[PDB]
Amino acid sequence: MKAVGLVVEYNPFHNGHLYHAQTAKLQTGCDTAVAVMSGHFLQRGEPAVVSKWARTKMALQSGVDLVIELPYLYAVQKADIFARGSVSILNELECEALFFGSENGDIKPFLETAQLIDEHKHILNDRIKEELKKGASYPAAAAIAFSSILHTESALDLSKPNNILGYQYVTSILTGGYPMKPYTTARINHIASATSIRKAMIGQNLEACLRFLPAASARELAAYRKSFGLWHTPESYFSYLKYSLSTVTARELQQVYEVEEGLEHRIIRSIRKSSSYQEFMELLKTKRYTWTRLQRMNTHILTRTKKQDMQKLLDNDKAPYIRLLGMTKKGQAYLSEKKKALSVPLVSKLSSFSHPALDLDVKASRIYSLPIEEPLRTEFDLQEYGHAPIRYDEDEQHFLN
Amino acid sequence: MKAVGLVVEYNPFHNGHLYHAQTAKLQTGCDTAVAVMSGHFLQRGEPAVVSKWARTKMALQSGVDLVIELPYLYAVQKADIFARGSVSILNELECEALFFGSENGDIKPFLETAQLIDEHKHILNDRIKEELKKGASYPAAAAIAFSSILHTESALDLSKPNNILGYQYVTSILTGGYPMKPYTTARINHIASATSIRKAMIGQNLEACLRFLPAASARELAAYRKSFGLWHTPESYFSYLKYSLSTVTARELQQVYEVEEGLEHRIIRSIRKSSSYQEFMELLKTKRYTWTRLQRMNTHILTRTKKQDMQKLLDNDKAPYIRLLGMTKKGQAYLSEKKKALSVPLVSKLSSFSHPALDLDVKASRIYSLPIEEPLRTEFDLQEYGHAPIRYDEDEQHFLN
Ligand SMILES: Nc1ncnc2c1ncn2[C@@H]1O[C@H](COP(=O)(O)CP(=O)(O)OP(=O)(O)O)[C@@H](O)[C@H]1O
Numbered sequence: 085m086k087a088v089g090l091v092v093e094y095n096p097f098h099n100g101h102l103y104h105a106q107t108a109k110l111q112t113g114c115d116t117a118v119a120v121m122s123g124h125f126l127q128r129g130e131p132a133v134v135s136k137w138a139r140t141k142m143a144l145q146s147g148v149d150l151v152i153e154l155p156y157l158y159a160v161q162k163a164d165i166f167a168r169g170s171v172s173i174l175n176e177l178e179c180e181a182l183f184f185g186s187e188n189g190d191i192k193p194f195l196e197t198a199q200l201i202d203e204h205k206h207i208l209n210d211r212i213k214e215e216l217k218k219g220a221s222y223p224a225a226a227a228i229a230f231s232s233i234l235h236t237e238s239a240l241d242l243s244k245p246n247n248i249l250g251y252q253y254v255t256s257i258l259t260g261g262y263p264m265k266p267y268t269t270a271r272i273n274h275i276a277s278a279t280s281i282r283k284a285m286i287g288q289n290l291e292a293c294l295r296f297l298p299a300a301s302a303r304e305l306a307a308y309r310k311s312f313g314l315w316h317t318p319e320s321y322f323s324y325l326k327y328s329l330s331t332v333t334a335r336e337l338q339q340v341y342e343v344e345e346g347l348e349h350r351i352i353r354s355i356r357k358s359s360s361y362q363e364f365m366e367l368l369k370t371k372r373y374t375w376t377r378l379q380r381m382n383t384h385i386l387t388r389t390k391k392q393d394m395q396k397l398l399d400n401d402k403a404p405y406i407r408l409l410g411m412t413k414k415g416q417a418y419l420s421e422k423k424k425a426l427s428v429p430l431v432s433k434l435s436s437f438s439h440p441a442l443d444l445d446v447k448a449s450r451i452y453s454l455p456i457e458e459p460l461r462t463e464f465d466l467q468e469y470g471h472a473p474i475r476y477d478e479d480e481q482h483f484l485n
Numbered sequence: 486m487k488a489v490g491l492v493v494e495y496n497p498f499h500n501g502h503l504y505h506a507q508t509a510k511l512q513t514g515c516d517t518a519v520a521v522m523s524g525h526f527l528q529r530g531e532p533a534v535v536s537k538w539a540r541t542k543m544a545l546q547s548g549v550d551l552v553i554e555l556p557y558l559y560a561v562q563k564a565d566i567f568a569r570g571s572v573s574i575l576n577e578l579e580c581e582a583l584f585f586g587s588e589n590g591d592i593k594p595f596l597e598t599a600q601l602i603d604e605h606k607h608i609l610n611d612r613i614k615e616e617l618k619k620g621a622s623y624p625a626a627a628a629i630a631f632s633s634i635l636h637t638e639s640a641l642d643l644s645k646p647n648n649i650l651g652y653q654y655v656t657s658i659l660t661g662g663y664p665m666k667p668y669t670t671a672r673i674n675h676i677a678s679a680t681s682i683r684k685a686m687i688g689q690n691l692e693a694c695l696r697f698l699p700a701a702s703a704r705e706l707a708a709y710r711k712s713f714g715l716w717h718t719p720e721s722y723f724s725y726l727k728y729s730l731s732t733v734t735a736r737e738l739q740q741v742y743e744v745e746e747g748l749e750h751r752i753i754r755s756i757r758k759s760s761s762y763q764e765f766m767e768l769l770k771t772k773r774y775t776w777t778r779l780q781r782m783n784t785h786i787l788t789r790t791k792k793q794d795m796q797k798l799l800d801n802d803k804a805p806y807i808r809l810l811g812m813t814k815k816g817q818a819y820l821s822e823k824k825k826a827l828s829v830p831l832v833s834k835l836s837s838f839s840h841p842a843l844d845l846d847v848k849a850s851r852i853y854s855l856p857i858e859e860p861l862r863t864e865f866d867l868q869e870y871g872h873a874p875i876r877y878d879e880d881e882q883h884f885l886n
């Protein structure tokens with residue numbers, strides 16, 4: 085009984101995510117698909133359109149057996165830390181495999197580059213040395229060193245995003261010592277992208293994106309809209325970001341994770357006169373800061389996550405806990421088989437453990453719900469503590485809760 | 486040139502305030518009405534209905550010749566402190582007279598009581614401790630020691646808020662030795678309480694109040710809700726209370742001004758389960774908290790005002806500055822005559838001076854606009870700076886700005 089791991093934000097689950105989970109099981113030979121998912125704030129620093137409890141329910145009927153929350157600790161980070169934490173969660177769960185998409189069905193060039201960078205790391209790092217001495221920036225210096233070994237056309241494209249993630253996955257399995265075998269396929273009812281489907285619902289029009297969405301997704305979505313009265317956008321939080329930066333001191337703001345030295349001054353100038361998140365993002369953007377990095381900082385500013393607390397938790401070599409969002413009868417089975425073997429606690433109901441990284445997960449949720457119009461927001465809030473793992477039965481349609 | 490000082494929060498300015506400003510210059514013989522007025526958040530603890538700017542306008546048109554902000558420092562405080570700073574500012578501007586409405590039109594039991602109490606002030610703390618050592622609570626031991634005198638047929642219930650403030654201005658005066666003579670009268674087109682008016686405005690009723698409000702005051706409110714789309718309610722800020730209590734730990738919330746030790750827990754717990762500001766309160770009530778003290782505490786939570794901020798600022802026996810909100814023709818001439826006399830900065834353009842207490846008023850002003858939707862909110866936030874001090878022409882109605 086062998087498990088194939090998937091690193092996923094499911095934003096939301098669509099037929100393309102369906103191609104992933106079925107190919108995965110098929111290609112890897114695993115009967116069980118375990119997905120580790122970013123819950124309410126994702127890798128690029130934006131909120132999930134819908135609660136992780138909803139998106140858990142979608143995937144459980146779409147062919148995923150276990151849904152484990154990737155803690156906020158590793159979820160809002162660039163790819164290498166993101167991959168480091170997610171892969172540690174899959175390693176902890178004894179997945180024989182890791183299945184990641186890029187535009188290539190070929191797993192080889194990811195491997196070829198890895199060792200190449202792995203082995204030349206010294207040569208690479210020493211080459212970054214000389215270059216900063218010639219007066220280059222570090223990113224330049226890095227771009228220069230890579231190019232000596234890398235510019236052979238393999239060709240691994242470090243541009244196309246989901247490739248980058250794949251490389252870091254391969255990276256993490258390599259330096260972690262994990263008995264994990266990386267797989268992959270070329271990313272593709274012709275299927276549409278996660279983003280463009282978000283634009284749909286956002287425009288209140290959910291009807292454009294259907295044939296691209298699995299059935300059960302559409303329901304729980306429309307259910308989430310009917311239940312809590314909104315779909316979530318970054319702009320939903322702008323008033324709360326605006327409060328956050330109002331109640332902070334520049335000294336305090338300097339200590340927020342991803343606010344680099346000196347920027348807290350630029351930050352504050354911008355928010356007072358910004359009428360939108362868009363405008364605010366605009367005034368903010370620098371060379372030192374890519375869009376998505378800013379959305380990560382703003383998120384940490386939103387959750388008021390400090391640097392030291394963050395360095396504290398990133399220090400841990402493995403995932404602090406395994407957070408159980410949902411399971412099939414198979415996922416429950418696989419689990420109860422490997423549960424004894426887990427070296428960190430399995431969290432189903434929130435009362436079952438206490439860790440600083442989990443407070444983070446729960447605080448993220450407490451912020452997330454704010455755009456819900458009261459009292460509906462309050463009802464929602466009972467879930468994080470209330471909701472026990474979501475259990476689906478693949479003999480069709482039995483939820484036990 | 487003679488001014489009478491007026492300690493006020495016009496929320497809104499009503500028929501009771503119109504009559505009190507005329508009688509002021511009447512009974513005090515002073516050619517000038519100088520009001521010190523809570524800016525945005527008030528003594529009762531709640532948000533002002535309308536910005537300090539527009540409320541200044543209901544006053545300048547009703548015979549108040551000068552309006553100074555009562556800093557948050559003084560404004561959102563227990564009456565003992567609120568009285569001190571307000572009276573303190575009015576003497577800085579050298580008001581020779583003081584005028585306050587009251588449930589007792591009679592200053593003599595105000596003057597008596599105060600002059601009575603210090604005469605015995607040793608006798609009290611003895612009977613207090615005698616009650617205290619016998620195990621009485623603080624207010625009880627106070628209620629008892631204080632009823633060992635004063636309990637004659639006089640009445641002048643200091644169970645009444647007006648008599649409270651009134652005694653407190655008078656006390657601050659005498660204790661301060663200020664050369665300012667205090668006056669008072671009872672409270673009576675027609676006339677009701679600002680509160681009864683507010684609650685009527687909350688009840689989707691404005692022109693109902695028009696017997697109870699002067700014209701300018703009435704004309705001024707409509708333009709507000711027109712431009713920013715709201716009247717400001719305590720409940721209106723609830724989401725930002727939920728959000729601000731969502732990011733804070735216990736030991737951080739402990740350090741907020743007016744949050745007693747250990748009460749952080751109950752607050753943090755209660756905010757989660759409250760879908761209503763009202764619900765929130767009832768979960769928070771302990772006999773060591775009046776209802777206003779709770780409200781006041783909730784403001785400090787919203788503005789993130791810390792014990793050390795407050796207490797380190799509360800220390801001084803003078804006022805940090807004079808913020809000029811607005812002035813009439815008469816007012817300006819009075820400011821000019823005494824301008825050289827102010828021992829503390831006269832702040833007109835905020836640019837001119839920077840102070841931690843001033844920093845605090847600016848903070849409250851950014852907190853104030855939060856319920857306002859954009860584009861307006863960003864535009865509201867402009868007013869604390871690039872707003873020239875308002876000026877109005879006493880004789881036939883002209884603002885010069
Ligand atoms: N059409 C498709 N074909 C193959 N794999 C897919 C796919 N759609 C999604 N996946 C895979 O599913 C895994 C998790 O996907 P997510 O990260 O949730 C969505 P995404 O594809 O990154 O959205 P995006 O297209 O807006 O970037 C990734 O390994 C991704 O490659």
Ligand SMILES: Nc1ncnc2c1ncn2[C@@H]1O[C@H](COP(=O)(O)CP(=O)(O)OP(=O)(O)O)[C@@H](O)[C@H]1O
Pocket residue numbers: 492493494495496500501502505585586587647670671672673676677678679680681
């Ligand atoms: N109708 C009236 N008669 C006498 N005094 C009045 C009055 N209305 C207000 N005042 C006095 O004017 C001063 C300023 O009052 P504010 O603090 O601005 C509102 P308030 O008076 O507390 O509301 P209220 O008028 O509903 O009591 C107070 O000292 C109050 O006693």
